[PDB]
Amino acid sequence: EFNILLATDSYKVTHYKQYPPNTSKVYSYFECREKKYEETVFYGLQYILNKYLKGKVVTKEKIQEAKDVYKEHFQDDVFNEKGWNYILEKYDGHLPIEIKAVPEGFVIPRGNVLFTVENTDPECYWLTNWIETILVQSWYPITVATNSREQKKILAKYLLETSGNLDGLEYKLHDFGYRGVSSQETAGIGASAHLVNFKGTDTVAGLALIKKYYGTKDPVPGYSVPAAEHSTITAWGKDHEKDAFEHIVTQFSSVPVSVVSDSYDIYNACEKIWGEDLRHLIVSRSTQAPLIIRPDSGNPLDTVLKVLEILGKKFPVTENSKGYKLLPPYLRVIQGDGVDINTLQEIVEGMKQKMWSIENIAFGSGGGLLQKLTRDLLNCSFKCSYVVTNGLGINVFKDPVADPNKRSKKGRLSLHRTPAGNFVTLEEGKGDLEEYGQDLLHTVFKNGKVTKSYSFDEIRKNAQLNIELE
Amino acid sequence: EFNILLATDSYKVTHYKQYPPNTSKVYSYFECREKKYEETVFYGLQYILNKYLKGKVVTKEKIQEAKDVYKEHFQDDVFNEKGWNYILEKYDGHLPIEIKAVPEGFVIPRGNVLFTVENTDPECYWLTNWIETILVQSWYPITVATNSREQKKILAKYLLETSGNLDGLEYKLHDFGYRGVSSQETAGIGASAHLVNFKGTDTVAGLALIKKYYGTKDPVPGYSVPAAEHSTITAWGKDHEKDAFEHIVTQFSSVPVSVVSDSYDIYNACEKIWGEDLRHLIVSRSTQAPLIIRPDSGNPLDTVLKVLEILGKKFPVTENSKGYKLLPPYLRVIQGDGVDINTLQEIVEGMKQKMWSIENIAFGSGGGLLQKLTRDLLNCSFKCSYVVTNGLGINVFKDPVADPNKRSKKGRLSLHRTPAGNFVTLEEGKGDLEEYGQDLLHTVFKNGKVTKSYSFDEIRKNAQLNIEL
Numbered sequence: 057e058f059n060i061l062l063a064t065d066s067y068k069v070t071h072y073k074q075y076p077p078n079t080s081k082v083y084s085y086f087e088c089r090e091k092k093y094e095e096t097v098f099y100g101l102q103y104i105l106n107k108y109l110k111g112k113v114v115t116k117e118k119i120q121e122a123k124d125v126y127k128e129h130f131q132d133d134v135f136n137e138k139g140w141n142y143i144l145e146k147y148d149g150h151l152p153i154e155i156k157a158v159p160e161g162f163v164i165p166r167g168n169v170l171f172t173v174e175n176t177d178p179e180c181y182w183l184t185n186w187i188e189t190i191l192v193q194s195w196y197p198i199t200v201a202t203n204s205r206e207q208k209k210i211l212a213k214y215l216l217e218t219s220g221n222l223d224g225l226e227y228k229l230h231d232f233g234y235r236g237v238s239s240q241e242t243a244g245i246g247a248s249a250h251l252v253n254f255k256g257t258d259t260v261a262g263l264a265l266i267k268k269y270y271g272t273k274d275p276v277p278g279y280s281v282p283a284a285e286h287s288t289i290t291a292w293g294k295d296h297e298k299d300a301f302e303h304i305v306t307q308f309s310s311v312p313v314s315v316v317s318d319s320y321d322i323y324n325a326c327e328k329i330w331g332e333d334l335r336h337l338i339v340s341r342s343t344q345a346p347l348i349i350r351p352d353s354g355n356p357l358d359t360v361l362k363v364l365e366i367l368g369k370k371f372p373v374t375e376n377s378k379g380y381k382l383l384p385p386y387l388r389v390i391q392g393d394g395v396d397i398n399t400l401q402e403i404v405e406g407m408k409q410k411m412w413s414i415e416n417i418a419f420g421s422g423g424g425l426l427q428k429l430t431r432d433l434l435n436c437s438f439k440c441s442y443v444v445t446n447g448l449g450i451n452v453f454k455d456p457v458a459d460p461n462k463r464s465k466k467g468r469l470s471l472h473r474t475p476a477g478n479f480v481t482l483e484e485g486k487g488d489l490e491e492y493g494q495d496l497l498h499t500v501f502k503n504g505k506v507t508k509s510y511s512f513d514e515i516r517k518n519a520q521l522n523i524e525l526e
Numbered sequence: 527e528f529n530i531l532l533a534t535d536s537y538k539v540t541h542y543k544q545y546p547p548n549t550s551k552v553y554s555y556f557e558c559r560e561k562k563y564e565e566t567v568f569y570g571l572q573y574i575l576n577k578y579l580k581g582k583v584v585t586k587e588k589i590q591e592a593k594d595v596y597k598e599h600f601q602d603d604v605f606n607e608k609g610w611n612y613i614l615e616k617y618d619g620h621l622p623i624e625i626k627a628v629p630e631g632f633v634i635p636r637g638n639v640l641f642t643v644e645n646t647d648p649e650c651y652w653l654t655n656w657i658e659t660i661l662v663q664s665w666y667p668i669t670v671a672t673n674s675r676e677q678k679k680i681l682a683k684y685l686l687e688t689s690g691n692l693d694g695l696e697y698k699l700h701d702f703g704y705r706g707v708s709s710q711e712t713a714g715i716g717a718s719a720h721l722v723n724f725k726g727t728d729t730v731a732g733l734a735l736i737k738k739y740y741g742t743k744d745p746v747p748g749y750s751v752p753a754a755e756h757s758t759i760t761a762w763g764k765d766h767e768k769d770a771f772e773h774i775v776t777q778f779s780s781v782p783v784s785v786v787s788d789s790y791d792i793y794n795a796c797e798k799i800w801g802e803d804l805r806h807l808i809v810s811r812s813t814q815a816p817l818i819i820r821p822d823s824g825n826p827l828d829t830v831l832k833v834l835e836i837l838g839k840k841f842p843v844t845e846n847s848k849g850y851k852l853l854p855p856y857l858r859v860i861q862g863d864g865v866d867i868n869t870l871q872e873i874v875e876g877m878k879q880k881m882w883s884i885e886n887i888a889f890g891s892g893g894g895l896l897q898k899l900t901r902d903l904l905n906c907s908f909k910c911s912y913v914v915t916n917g918l919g920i921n922v923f924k925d926p927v928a929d930p931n932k933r934s935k936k937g938r939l940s941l942h943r944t945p946a947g948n949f950v951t952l953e954e955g956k957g958d959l960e961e962y963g964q965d966l967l968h969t970v971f972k973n974g975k976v977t978k979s980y981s982f983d984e985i986r987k988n989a990q991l992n993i994e995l
């Protein structure tokens with residue numbers, strides 16, 4: 057049983073007592089604050105709204121549990137029982153909050169308002185920032201989605217250059233991060249964010265999250281194929297690596313199959329086992345069912361280059377229309393070790409320099425894709441910008457002397473299209489002057505109800521690359 | 527509805543067809559592989575066992591769901607329905623797996639076996655590595671707990687050097703990481719791992735996790751106190767920062783309270799607002815209810831030093847018995863911005879060089895404590911070391927030519943004390959020779975039941991620093 061009264065930073069329990077007396081409105085906003093990563097993919101809030109914020113989230117039992125925990129945690133009575141009982145009694149435990157947000161999947165430059173939060177009942181001035189902690193966790197799917205999309209830009213550039221098209225782009229970066237993230241819940245959230253940009257995942261948890269909270273016309277949003285792990289090779293004994301290979305590719309003779317080849321000696325496995333002993337089992341495979349050789353250790357770029365060099369001398373290589381070398385269609389490579397946005401760039405650039413098409417390879421990333429990210433990468437941040445006290449609205453902000461990068465926006469915010477068609481955030485309620493057309497934010501939550509939502513297919517369309525669009 | 531059949535890496539669905547035929551046993555182990563962070567706190571497996579692995583985790587409905595999803599995900603029928611049905615029918619859907627583990631809270635050098643996993647029924651040879659993905663997520667609480675203990679070591683060394691004792695050590699690094707982690711579940715797991723070493727947290731999700739899965743004699747494992755955030759200051763308006771401060775310290779006159787002081791100009795706030803205009807409300811406070819001034823921007827060390835210098839000129843400083851300067855007891859500082867293990871060390875060393883006692887300060891860490899960590903930090907890894915095929919045991923391993931650091935251990939494993947009282951992992955079943963006393967791994971899970979558990983109190987005892995001891 058999740059309890060929203062226990063889902064905040066401890067000190068926020070004490071804040072109701074700290075605002076100016078007679079404050080009736082607290083209005084706050086989220087941005088990826090300006091400080092690469094010039095634009096962000098807005099994704100993930102719809103999950104939070106539905107799983108944690110909508111409907112009857114306050115009960116008499118949840119109030120008593122919070123009172124009991126906070127009494128001990130603070131060694132004192134500081135919990136706002138009265139305020140939460142008000143919500144329970146007046147709104148049948150539905151939050152009197154309104155959230156406006158940019159559509160999911162939207163790609164927006166840094167430093168723009170992405171969502172706003174305000175209370176809808178003056179008695180609940182304290183509630184806006186109570187839920188800061190839970191809403192700010194949107195940084196994670198935004199950040200995964202964004203960093204995944206930045207890797208797609210890299211892959212698109214180099215695939216276009218070396219092959220002349222983008223065929224298969226959406227399967228070039230596979231999610232291997234299930235084991236490397238910090239929890240099951242994170243696994244589903246992060247896997248779903250990667251699927252905004254790609255279709256290949258081993259993180260099965262993402263599929264159910266998307267089905268429940270977003271939806272796709274297709275039965276599932278992402279796909280995989282059979283593959284070995286080191287245990288299914290090493291179990292055969294060190295002298296029987298050939299036997300394991302032969303067994304695995306025969307068991308999966310008619311579908312694609314990846315086979316990890318570096319248990320003992322990747323270069324031997326490629327040149328002597330695959331390239332000589334078992335070559336007859338590879339060159340007979342369908343283009344729809346290639347063997348995908350998997351190195352998994354050594355310098356990522358050097359190992360890929362050396363594997364391709366070996367395979368190129370044992371198998372028939374062609375020269376595609378762009379002048380780049382291409383393995384036969386029954387043979388590919390996957391690099392699933394040490395991949396993050398930086399090493400991905402190094403590997404594709406290294407391949408290009410050695411005249412190997414990016415058609416030859418795909419990448420898997422795990423920790424780099426889903427875990428090695430923090431809230432500082434995009435400076436995702438929630439701040440109060442407007443309050444009403446004693447009936448007077450006031451524009452508020454922070455502006456720390458030693459760090460102008462932490463300055464926050466002032467007053468009521470709105471998001472607009474500029475005359476050149478770009479985004480701009482207007483501060484101080486200036487959107488009301490109607491000089492920049494309509495506010496692009498939409499009301500997505502009001503008074504315990506989700507009022508606007510997006511399918512996963514729409515989110516993917518919104519998050520497309522300009523090259524894909526053109 | 528969590529479904530263990532859908533809680534693995536997709537490719538593991540296909541592995542049952544890949545092992546050698548006539549394989550009746552797959553035995554695997556977890557270590558924090560050797561390649562800084564020389565020892566690790568084993569913590570978190572009991573959570574995973576209870577939440578996800580115990581009891582009736584296979585049902586007819588879960589089998590059908592898995593079958594339906596994998597048909598679409600693979601665009602093919604490759605799911606082992608027959609093996610999952612067997613578990614359902616023979617064992618009432620309980621997992622035929624035995625897991626042996628070092629006790630939680632144990633502090634073990636890198637490169638040692640921490641737990642092992644094996645199937646208890648020959649038909650379920652494939653199940654040992656099915657649950658790799660879920661068990662390997664133990665890397666996270668191990669790493670949080672380990673990194674938090676390493677920070678407690680730094681604080682202990684500097685507190686002892688500048689003050690002569692460890693009083694309040696367990697409150698010197700507070701968890702501010704709730705907003706900065708990737709999910710609610712991570713929050714609870716990560717906050718609980720930090721609580722192995724400290725008692726201060728704002729990540730309330732940790733408390734419920736510990737109560738449900740571990741348990742403490744005391745009502746709760748962690749504590750906090752009132753504090754401002756920027757909104758409760760800025761809401762007053764720029765010209766009314768002093769009004770906000772005055773209001774807040776008066777609301778919380780008799781308990782400790784932290785007050786963020788950098789909304790506009792931290793140095794002004796310290797020297798003029800706290801140091802002059804509101805000084806009379808500070809110097810009257812109880813030593814049990816100090817004001818804790820919070821800077822939150824700028825270079826973390828330079829800002830701490832400048833704040834201490836400002837305060838030291840507006841308030842009565844003493845020199846403690848070690849020669850270090852000490853604010854009056856009603857006034858302390860908390861640095862909650864930019865703290866990780868590296869910057870923590872820089873700040874305390876900077877303070878020591880400027881003759882400020884670590885008694886003066888506490889630290890809060892959020893993303894650095896709970897998010898900015900990966901499975902590569904301690905090389906937490908799960909590998910098969912032993913199989914039985916055709917009734918013959920075979921010791922198996924990887925040893926990639928280009929990276930000896932990824933070599934794995936061979937055979938059946940056990941963990942022992944050495945004659946000097948250190949730890950050693952015996953390979954190749956050599957523990958059976960009984961030359962090294964009893965195995966320190968204990969059966970913690972077998973055939974769907976959790977067989978040995980630890981209280982959070984025991985875990986804390988096991989994870990103590992030697993200096994505490």
Ligand SMILES: O=S1(=O)NC(NCc2ccc(S(=O)(=O)N3CCC(N4CCCC4)CC3)cc2)=Nc2ccncc21
Pocket residue numbers: 224227228229230232256258280281282283284285312313314315316348350388389390392418419420535536537
């Ligand atoms: O490398 S693994 O052993 N594989 C794996 N899953 C199988 C796999 C194999 C091949 C590719 S691929 O990207 O080459 N790929 C996917 C899509 C492609 N086609 C499918 C649609 C059109 C292109 C087939 C090949 C992607 C994924 N999981 C792992 C998890 C953790 N570590 C390692 C691995």
Ligand SMILES: O=S1(=O)NC(NCc2ccc(S(=O)(=O)N3CCC(N4CCCC4)CC3)cc2)=Nc2ccncc21
Pocket residue numbers: 065066067694697698699700702726728749750751752753754755782783784785786818820858859860862888889890
């Ligand atoms: O800085 S905050 O505004 N505070 C806060 N919680 C209050 C707080 C205040 C002071 C200390 S402390 O370490 O000084 N401390 C002193 C008193 C307490 N006593 C418990 C027994 C002995 C000391 C221990 C914790 C720790 C924690 N939460 C935040 C969350 C996110 N960012 C910032 C903050």
